Design an enzyme around this catalytic site. Structure first.
Site, PDB file in Angstrom:
ATOM      1  CE  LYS A  25      -4.006  -0.600   2.358  1.00  0.00           C
ATOM      2  NZ  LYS A  25      -4.843  -0.588   3.566  1.00  0.00           N
TER       3      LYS A  25
HETATM    4  C1  LIG Z   1      -6.184  -0.509   3.535  1.00  0.00           C
HETATM    5  C2  LIG Z   1      -6.852  -0.058   2.278  1.00  0.00           C
HETATM    6  O1  LIG Z   1      -6.722   1.336   2.123  1.00  0.00           O
HETATM    7  C3  LIG Z   1      -7.047  -0.445   4.791  1.00  0.00           C
HETATM    8  O2  LIG Z   1      -6.313  -0.895   5.907  1.00  0.00           O
HETATM    9  C4  LIG Z   1      -7.586   0.993   4.943  1.00  0.00           C
HETATM   10  O3  LIG Z   1      -6.506   1.921   4.822  1.00  0.00           O
HETATM   11  C5  LIG Z   1      -8.362   1.349   6.236  1.00  0.00           C
HETATM   12  O4  LIG Z   1      -9.735   0.980   6.117  1.00  0.00           O
HETATM   13  C6  LIG Z   1      -8.351   2.837   6.510  1.00  0.00           C
HETATM   14  O5  LIG Z   1      -9.173   3.190   7.657  1.00  0.00           O
HETATM   15  P1  LIG Z   1      -9.509   4.752   7.912  1.00  0.00           P
HETATM   16  O6  LIG Z   1      -9.482   5.416   6.544  1.00  0.00           O
HETATM   17  O7  LIG Z   1     -10.897   4.758   8.546  1.00  0.00           O
HETATM   18  O8  LIG Z   1      -8.420   5.287   8.837  1.00  0.00           O
END
Ligand SMILES: *[C@H](CO)[C@@H](O)[C@H](O)[C@H](O)COP(=O)(O)O
Ligand SMILES: *C(CO)[C@@H](O)[C@H](O)[C@H](O)COP(=O)(O)O
Ligand SMILES: *[C@H](CO)[C@@H](O)[C@H](O)[C@H](O)COP(=O)(O)O
Ligand SMILES: *[C@H](CO)[C@@H](O)[C@H](O)[C@H](O)COP(=O)(O)O
Ligand SMILES: *[C@H](CO)[C@@H](O)[C@H](O)[C@H](O)COP(=O)(O)O
Ligand SMILES: *[C@H](CO)[C@@H](O)[C@H](O)[C@H](O)COP(=O)(O)O
Ligand SMILES: *[C@H](CO)[C@@H](O)[C@H](O)[C@H](O)COP(=O)(O)O
Ligand SMILES: *[C@H](CO)[C@@H](O)[C@H](O)[C@H](O)COP(=O)(O)O
EC number: 4.1.2.-
Lengths: 220, 220, 220, 220, 220, 220, 220, 220
Positions: free
Chosen positions: D85
Site C-alpha cells: 500500500k
Molecule cells: C487498507 C486499504 O486502504 C485499509 O487498511 C484501509 O486503509 C483502512 O480501512 C483505513 O481506515 P480509515 O481510513 O478509517 O483510517
C-alpha cells in the site's frame, strides 16, 4: 404574455395586427437596415400600423455609456411608448444603470449567456433578450440558456422579464414559452407558421364536406 | 440578489462600481495581504470606491472565541456597514453565538461542508460562505455542496443567506446562482468574464455594418 | 431546527453547549446505563449543564400501557417539562394515546419503519425518532425510511416532527437534514466531526501565513 | 469479488475465516499500531489465521519515493502474497511507477478523490482504496467518490480494481458493492453486522416452533 | 426461468404440474409442518407428483455448522439431487462453505438483506432466497432488496441465482421477475391468481357469443 | 419485424398486400364471426390474398385442454403455415404445454397481464399477444403492460416474441413498436392511418407547384 | 388522516380501538357475510366496540339506482355516523347523484380505475375506495391506480378523499399513504403487522439488558 | 371539472345525463352532420335532454373573420349558455379577437399544436380544444401536445381552460385529466367504457354470492 413581432415591415404589421394580440414591435439595427427606412419614419409608421397603440423597441448604436444615454433620449423623442435596447457589454451595463436612474425603460439585448442577462436585469433593465437562434447557430444550447436565464430572473430579479428573441423555427419559440418567458418577439415567418397548418386546413375541409353531405351547403 | 467583488484592489472597485450593481466588497486575510494595506485604511478606501455606500466584509484572525469577539469589535469600529467573517470551527461557532447575543452581524466562512455551514447559520450567522472552488480543487463537488447548503438553509435557517465564494470560472458562479444563492462574491477576473464575449462583440460589429450599409453612417 | 446531543456525558454537554446552539439532550436506556448515573440524578445534571434550560428526553421501561403511563409520571416529576419517549409497540401506542389525553408530551421511539412512525404521531406523539443507523446496520435503508417518514408526517400529521436518531457517520445525519427533519440528535463523535476538518484547518493556516507575510503578525 | 477483513486481530481473523469466504486481510499503520504487533510477527500470524493462504496488504511509512521502494522490498521479504500500500501523494505516485517497473504489486491508498485514485491506477497500482467513511466524515460524499472512481477505472484503467475501505455502517459497504467495487475490506464490527439480524433470528425461531408443533422435536 | 411452487400440498402439486411449466417444489420448516407429513415421506411424494422429475428444496434445522452439514447429508439421502436450504447466519455461512467443499448444492435462505444474500453466494450457494413479503411486512422494501441482491449477484457472483420467495400478491412476484430473478417460488394462492382473471374470462365469453351469433355454435 | 393485418376482409388484404410488407394475417373468433366465413374457406382465401404466402393465426374455441389440442390439429390441417392461438387460462396453459410436446406452434392470446403472458411463453408459446386497447379501455395501462411483458420475455423467454394486438389509435401501435415488440397485428383502420397524412399530402402538392413554377410541367 | 379497520370482528375492534387512533370501521358484503352478523346487529356492536364513537361504512346490495337509494335510507336508519358505500357502476353513479341531492354521504366503492373513481367523486361521493390488492392480483398496478386517482381528486375534486382499501401486505398500504391518500382501511392482519417487528422487539430487549446491567432491575 | 359529452345523439344524452355529472354537450360540424338535425332544433333538444340546463358548444362554418362573427351571433341567439367554437386559423384568430370585444364567449378549436392553442387563449378564447386523437393518428404525440398546451395556459393565460377532445380510448382521456385539463368532452363509446368493467362486475357478483351464502337472500 407580451407578444411582439420582430420586423420593420409596416404593411405586414398592419395585416398581422388584426390577427394576433400584439403588444407591439421590436427592431434591431439589422432589421431597421433591412427595411431601408430610418427610425424617425419607421417607428411612427409602426405605431400607426398597430392601430395607433402598442410598445416599440429600438436599439442604441453608440459604443460609450454616455453616447448610449444620448441615443436613448433621441429614440424616446421619436415615439412615446418606446423601450431602449442596450447591448449588455461593459459600457452597456453602465448605460443601463444611468438610464435606470433617469427612469428611461431599457431592455438588455445581445444576451448570449444567462449570467450576462441577469446582470442587465439587476442593473435596471425591465426586459432581457437572449438571442436564442444565435446561441443555437454557434454550437451552444439556446433553450438551455433561456431556461437558465428565466430561472435567474425568477430567483434573483423577478421584476424583470425575458423577452425571447432570434428564431428560425416555431419549436424554438414554443420551447421559450414552455420555459416561462413572459414576453417574446417573433419574425414574420415563424409567427405565420404557428397559425398555418395542413392538418388544421384538412380538418376544416372534412367538416365542410360532412356538413354539405347532410345539409346541401357548407354554411350555417 | 447581493453582488459583491472579492478584492482589495481599490482602483478596480472604483472602475467596476459604475458597471456592475454592486452590493459591496468582501475581503479575507489573503486578499487583504495581497493588497498590502491594513484594514483600517483599506475598508474606508473601498467604501469611497463604492461611491460612499455598500456593505463590507472582513475576517477575524484570533484562534479563541474571546479573541474573535475582540477582533469583531475592532472591525465594526472601523466602519458602519460591516459584517464580520468568522471561520466555522469549534471556537468560531462559539464566537458566532456570542456575537449573536451582542448584536454584531456575522458571516460563517471557510465552509467546506453543508452541515458545517448550516451550523453557523443556526448559531446566528446572517451569511454562510462555502469555498466552492476549494471544494472543487480538493477532489469534492463544490456545486453539490452549495446545493446541499442552500437546501439546509431553505429548510432549517431561512433567514440566513448563502454568500457563494471562491471561483475560477464563470460556470461555477452561474451554477451557484442557479442553485438559489441569494448573495455571491466574485474575483475580478470572473466578474469581467461575465461581461466580455467574442459572440456579443461580433453581434455588435454586424449590427454596425448592416446599419452603415443601409444609412451610410454608424450612428442614430 | 432543534439540535440535540444524544448522551449521558454531563461534562461533554457543558463543553459543547457553548459551541453548538443546542435545543437540549436526548437519552435512551442504553445511553443512561453507559453513564452509570440514575435518572433522578442525571436529568437535573444535564439540565444544569445546558445552562439551566432546554428540552430533555427520557424513555419509559415498563411493558404495559398502564406501566408506561406510571413511568411517564415519574419521569415528569424528575423534569417537569421533559418529553417522554415511548417505544412504538402495541402497548406503546396505547400509552401514547393515554399520555395525549393526560397532556404529557411524547416521542415515539424505536421506529424502524415509516408507517410505524406515522402511527405514533397520529396517536399523539409530538416527535417520532427513527433509528437511522440501526435500519442501515440490519440491511435496510435508513435514509429511505426517514424520507418516507418525513413525507408521511408532512402529508398526514404535520404537527409532529421527525427527531432523527442513531448515527455512525455525519453523512447519515446530513442526509436526514436534507430530507427535511425538523429535529435531530447527534452522538458526541458525529457532532464533533461536523466542525472538525483538515481542509478548514489548512485554510486557516494559509490565511495566517499570508497575513504574517504581509504584516509580520496574525492580529487585527 | 475479493472480500478482506481490515484488522490486526489475529484471533478474530481465525474465527471469521471459518465463516466468511475471505480473500485475505488488509492493514494500515493505525490498524498495525492498535494491534501492538510488529509486521514481521503480524503478517505471518495473519497468514496462519487465514489457514496458510490469502492475500495480505501492508503500507509503506517512508515519505520519499526511494524510501517507499525500500519499504516495499522489506514488506515483500516478510510474506509471499503481499501487496504494498502506497499513499497517493506526489512521492507516492513516483513510487508506484518505480514499483510497477520492478514488478512489485501495489495498492494506491489514502484516496479521497476519484481523479487522485485514477492517477494511482494509471501509474501501475492493481488496487485503489478510497477512504469512504473519511470522505463522509469530513463533509463530502464517500459513495459518490466511489461511483466516480469506479467509473474512471472502468473507462480508463479496467485492469485496476477499487478496494473500498473505511466503513462505520453496513450501508456504506453495500453502496460500494452496488457501485461495482470488485474488492472490499471490512472492519470486524461492520462485517459481523452483515450476518447478524433480529429479523433473521426471529424467522429461525418461528421455523423451530412450527417444526416442534408438528413433529415434537426441533431437529431433522 | 425456473418456476417453483412453495408448498407441501402433494395433490395441489400434481394438479398444477399439468398447468404450469414447473422446475420443482421448495419447502421450508413451516410449510412442511403445515402439511404434517415428515420429509422422508413428503419429498418422495412431491417428486412423484411432479411426474418423477424436477428439483426439490428442503431446509436444515440444526444450529451449528457441523449439525447443518449432518442435516444436509440426511436430506440428500432422502432426495439424492435435492438442493439444501441453509439460513444465512454465522453458522449457516460456515455450513455453506463446508457443503461447497463437499459438493452438496445449497441455497442461502432467510435472506432479509442484499449483502447477506451476496455473502451466501460467495460462500458457495447456487441460489439465494430473499423473503420478499417478510421484508415488506416489517416496514422495509422487499422489491428494493431484491433489486439490490440481483445487482450484487450480477456484479459479484454471476454463477448464483436469486430464487425469490415469500409472496402475498402477484404484483410482488411480477416485480421480482422484472428485476431479473432467474428463479422464483410461488405459494398456491398467488400462482393461481396469475392465471385467473375476470377480464380474460369476459373476453372468452364475448368470443363464444360472437361466434355463436354467426355460426350457431362454439366449435371449430 | 413481422407486420400482420388483423382482419377477415379478404379483399382488403389483397389491396393492402401490395402496399405493406405483410408477414400475414391474424384472426380471432370475433374477427372470423364478422366476416361470416368459416375458417376452412377464410384461411385459404387469405393465403391467396397475400399472394400465396405468409403466416396465418387462428384461435381454438374449446374450453378443455384436450379439446383445444383437437381444435389445434383441425386448424393445422386447413393450412400449412399456421400458428394456433390459445387463450392463456388454466386449461389454455395446459394445452400450450401439450402442443409444445406435439410440435404444433402456438401463440398465447387474451393476455391482459405481463406475468400471464410470460407463463404462456414458458409453457411453449412462440408468440404472446397482449390485448393493448382492452387493457387501456378497462382502466389499466396497456403500453406499460406491453413494456413489462417485453421485459419478461427478453429476460426469461427470449425465443418468444410479443405480437402486440388490439388497437384504436396509431399511437398505441407505435408505443408497442418502441417498446421492442418484434411482431404486431393492425386493424385495417389503424394500418391505413399510418400511411395517410394531410401534412405529407401538402408537402407533395407544394413540391408539384414549385416544380410547375420552374419547369412548366408536373413531370420528370 | 382517517384510519379505519376493515372488519366485522367486533371483539378485535374493541381490542385494537385501545391501540390505534381509529376513525371507525369499514364493512363490505363479504366482510359482513364472514362475520355472520346482520347489519342491524353488527353496526351497533361496532359503534360500542369503538367506545360509542367513530364513522361506520356499509354497502348497498340493490342493482338499480332506486333500490340503492332505498338501501341507503335503511342503512342510515340503523346508525347515525354512517357513510353509504355505492359500487361505481352505471346504476351506482346514478344513485350517488341522487344521494348527493338528498344529503346522504356516499363512498364510491369497487373502484378498479382512476377515471371511474374520479367520476364517483364528481357525482357527489365524499370518499372513493380503490381495491388496491385486487388490481394487483389481476395483473394491474394497484399503487399506480391510487397515484392516478389521488392526482385526479387533487386536481379535479379536492373535496373528495381516497379511502384506500384491499391489502395483503403493509407495503401496499404504506405506498398508498405515501401517494397522499387522506383515509385508509386496514384488514386486521396488515394493521397488526405495522406495529409488530422483530427489530423493534430486539431493541427493547437490548435496552432492558443494558438497564439491568447498570441498575440491577428492568424498571424505572 | 367540466365533463361534456361529444354528440348530437339527443336520446343518448337524455339517458347518460342521469348517470354522469354532465356540464353539457359539445358539437362540431361532423357530429352535427351525423345527427342530420340543424342546430336551431338540435341545441334546444340537447338543452332539454340535459334537464333544461348545461352549457352547449357549437362551431362557426364561415371562412372569413366577419362571416364567423355573423355565425357566432346566430348561434348565441338559439340558446343562452352557448360557447362559440372557432377554428384557430388566420381568420379564426381574427374572429376570436372581435368576439372578445363583443363579449361572445369562445373556444379555439381544431388545435393540433400548443402554441396555436395558446394564441387562441391570448386572443380571448375561454377554452382551447386540442384534437388529441387526431394528433395521435397523424404520427404525433397527442398527450404531449396537451401537456404543453396546459403548461402554456397555466403560465401565460391562466383564465383559459383546456377542453380536451377527440378520443378513441379511455387511456387518452385519462392522460388528459392527469395532465390537468379542467374540461373534457367524451364520445359516447369512451364515456361508457369508463364505467363498464368485467372486474367490477365480478366483484359485485362475488359480494352477492357471499351475502346469499350467509343470509339466504341478496337484499339488505
Ligand atoms: C487498507 C486499504 O486502504 C485499509 O487498511 C484501509 O486503509 C483502512 O480501512 C483505513 O481506515 P480509515 O481510513 O478509517 O483510517
Ligand atoms: C369540440 C371541441 O370542444 C368537439 O366537438 C371536438 O371537435 C371533437 O371532439 C373532435 O373529435 P374528432 O375530430 O375525433 O371527431
Ligand atoms: C430585439 C430584442 O428584443 C430583437 O429585435 C432581437 O435583437 C433580434 O431578434 C435579434 O435577431 P438576430 O440576433 O438573429 O439578428
Ligand atoms: C469571503 C466570503 O464571503 C471571501 O473573501 C472568501 O473568503 C473568498 O472568496 C475565499 O477565496 P479562497 O478561499 O479561494 O482564497
Ligand atoms: C432518543 C430518540 O430521540 C435517542 O436517545 C435514541 O433512542 C438513540 O439515539 C437510538 O440510537 P442508538 O440505539 O444507535 O443509540
Ligand atoms: C424456500 C426458499 O427457496 C421457500 O420455501 C421460502 O423459505 C419461503 O417461501 C419463505 O416465505 P414465507 O416465510 O413467507 O413462507
Ligand atoms: C390475435 C392476436 O395475435 C388477434 O386476432 C387479436 O386477438 C385481436 O387483436 C384482439 O382484438 P380485440 O380483443 O380487441 O377484439
Ligand atoms: C370498503 C371500502 O371499499 C372496504 O370494506 C373494502 O371494500 C374492502 O377492503 C374490499 O376488500 P376486497 O377488495 O379485497 O374484496
Amino acid at each position: 404574455m407580451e407578444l411582439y413581432l420582430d420586423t420593420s415591415d409596416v404593411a405586414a404589421v398592419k395585416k398581422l395586427a388584426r390577427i394576433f394580440p400584439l403588444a407591439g414591435v421590436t427592431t434591431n439595427p439589422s432589421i431597421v437596415a433591412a427595411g431601408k427606412t430610418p427610425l424617425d419614419e419607421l417607428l411612427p409608421a409602426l405605431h400607426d400600423a398597430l392601430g395607433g397603440k402598442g410598445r416599440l423597441f429600438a436599439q442604441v448604436m453608440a459604443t460609450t455609456a454616455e453616447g448610449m444615454v444620448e441615443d436613448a433620449r433621441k429614440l424616446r423623442a421619436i415615439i412615446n411608448d418606446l423601450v431602449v435596447k442596450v447591448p449588455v457589454t461593459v459600457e452597456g451595463l453602465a448605460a443601463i444603470k444611468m438610464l435606470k436612474a433617469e427612469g428611461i425603460p431599457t431592455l438588455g439585448t445581445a444576451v448570449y449567456g444567462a449570467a450576462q442577462g441577469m446582470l442587465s436585469a439587476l442593473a435596471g433593465a425591465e426586459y432581457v433578450a437572449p438571442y436564442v437562434n444565435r446561441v443555437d447557430a454557434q454550437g451552444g444550447d439556446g433553450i438551455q440558456t433561456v431556461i437558465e436565464l428565466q430561472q435567474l430572473l425568477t430567483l434573483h430579479a423577478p421584476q424583470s422579464k425575458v423577452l425571447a428573441a432570434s428564431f428560425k423555427t416555431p419549436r424554438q419559440a414554443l420551447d421559450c414559452l414552455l420555459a416561462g418567458c413572459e414576453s417574446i418577439t417573433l419574425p414574420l415567418d415563424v409567427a405565420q407558421q404557428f397559425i398555418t397548418s395542413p392538418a388544421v386546413d384538412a380538418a376544416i375541409v372534412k367538416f365542410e364536406q360532412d356538413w354539405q353531405g347532410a345539409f346541401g351547403r357548407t354554411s350555417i
